[PDB]
Ligand binder design. Structure first.
Ligand SMILES: CNC(=O)c1ccc(S(N)(=O)=O)cc1
Ligand SMILES: CNC(=O)c1ccc(S(N)(=O)=O)cc1
Ligand SMILES: CNC(=O)c1ccc(S(N)(=O)=O)cc1
Ligand SMILES: CNC(=O)c1ccc(S(N)(=O)=O)cc1
Lengths: 178, 245
């Protein structure tokens, strides 16, 4: 099997840690959801190809501009995350995360991922956002941002229900192989 | 790691590590607080284990089996002895706090009510100065270590055979040389996340809420100082490239 490296980036509370936990355990933990993610090496078989995909989180590094880039050497695929319940997490994608990733990871594919898709039809979320003249991120807003930033593609998932999680990592493996 | 500590931290949470008849005697808020303290100690035990893989399996294995040129092994594993001393001492204090809190007749039932004071001590005074100096040096030598590793693996047959041999076991799947270096660099930024969540469930005793708030501040001061003190070293860098930063 060939070895590839994946790193997930995004604002704090975009759900990147939870996404890595749910994928690596194949389950949303029923008893205790960990606070942090160390690393993991996933055995993935996609389109007949076997890959060892090493997974890394940048959670905790968002405020440290000289420590954070130490996560980037030899990355093969970037997952760039935002939360669908946070239109502000999407606004930081083009002028903060995208220029950073393009500088440290030139020519590395980026997959823009809209996390917490289950909150698009959550009434408490819609009420809270409506008080700030906002609404959950629409699918076309996510696709347009991915198109604008030069992303390899756009995907959505829910770590809470596991919907779409496997597909995100299978596509990330295919991108890493290209 | 040693078997005794591995078994004490084998469960996915504190609520699954203690006996169910002991768990039932506590309020939900206490269980939530202890689950996060358990995660801090468990991840610290794993971090010390990562440092032992670097010092004992890789570093000492290369010194004893290979004929690498002087200063090459130090370039691959910068500051590992110092980092091991800092974290092994910290882990010893965390495990002793847990052990003193065990109920008589039990090796698994405990509640840690006073973590804040231990964290203030770790993240203040000489131990905090040493953590700041050591991570500022380690993180500035991180990229050079990765490049030296890649060069040796691509060009030296005995080095490649050594690496493939010692990393073959399934228990080393997540712990190759490059993976250990990044696990160590990332350790320090996990502390505020764990401490903030412990603090969220430590309001019952005002002394404890205040101590954890002080500890969170000290950890952030350490991270700010380390972040400001980093400048990537590069093998063969010229003075002109350095002073034109
Ligand atoms: C029901 N969900 C939780 O208890 C929970 C707890 C913690 C997280 S974290 N620290 O963001 O990864 C997420 C979810
Ligand atoms: C072939 N049947 C499967 O269920 C299956 C399930 C998961 C994978 S992957 N792409 O390694 O995560 C492959 C195959
Ligand atoms: C202090 N920052 C570094 O040493 C560093 C950070 C990132 C890289 S990368 N992702 O290979 O371009 C190299 C070096
Ligand atoms: C009372 N404060 C201290 O003793 C202290 C000592 C050292 C640090 S450092 N060098 O950022 O990790 C912070 C705080």
């Amino acid at each position: 099997a060939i070895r590839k490296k994946l790193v997930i980036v995004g604002d704090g509370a975009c759900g990147k840690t939870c996404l890595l936990i749910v994928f690596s355990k194949d389950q949303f933990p029923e008893v205790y959801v960990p606070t942090v993610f160390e690393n993991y090496v996933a055995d993935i078989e996609v389109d007949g190809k076997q890959v060892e995909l090493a997974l890394w989180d940048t959670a905790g590094q968002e405020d440290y501009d000289r420590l954070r880039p130490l996560s980037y050497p030899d990355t093969d695929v970037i997952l760039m995350c935002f939360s669908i319940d946070s239109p502000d997490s999407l606004e930081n994608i083009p002028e903060k995360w995208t220029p950073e990733v393009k500088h440290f990871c030139p020519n590395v594919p980026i997959i823009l991922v809209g996390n917490k898709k289950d909150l698009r039809n959550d009434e408490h979320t819609r009420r809270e956002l409506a008080k700030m003249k906002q609404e959950p991120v629409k699918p076309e807003e996510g696709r347009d941002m991915a198109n604008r930033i030069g992303a390899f593609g756009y995907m959505e998932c829910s770590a809470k229900t596991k919907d779409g999680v496997r597909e995100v990592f299978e596509m990330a493996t295919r991108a890493a192989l290209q | 790691s040693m078997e005794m500590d591995e078994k004490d931290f084998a469960a996915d949470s504190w609520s699954l590590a203690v006996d169910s008849s002991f768990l039932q005697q506590h309020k939900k808020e206490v269980m939530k607080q202890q689950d996060v303290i358990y995660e801090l100690i468990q991840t610290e035990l794993h971090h010390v284990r990562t440092l032992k893989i670097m010092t004992r399996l890789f570093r000492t294995g290369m010194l004893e089996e290979l004929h690498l040129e002087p200063g090459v092994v130090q370039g691959l594993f910068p500051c590992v002895d110092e980092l091991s001393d800092i974290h092994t001492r910290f882990l010893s204090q965390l495990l002793e706090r847990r052990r003193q809190a065990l109920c008589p007749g039990s090796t698994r039932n405990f509640v840690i009510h006073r973590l804040g004071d231990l964290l203030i001590s770790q993240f203040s005074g000489p131990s905090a100065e040493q953590m700041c100096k050591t991570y500022s040096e380690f993180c500035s030598r991180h990229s050079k270590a990765l490049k030296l590793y890649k060069e040796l693996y691509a060009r030296d047959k005995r080095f490649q055979q050594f690496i493939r041999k010692v990393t073959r076991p399934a228990v080393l799947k997540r712990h190759g040389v490059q993976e250990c270096i990044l696990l160590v660099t990332q350790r320090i930024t996990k502390y505020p996340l764990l401490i903030s969540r412990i603090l969220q469930h430590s309001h019952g005793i005002e002394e404890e809420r205040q101590d954890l708030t002080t500890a969170l501040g000290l950890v952030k001061e350490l991270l700010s100082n380390v972040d400001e003190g980093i400048y990537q070293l590069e093998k063969g860098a010229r003075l002109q490239e350095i002073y034109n930063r």
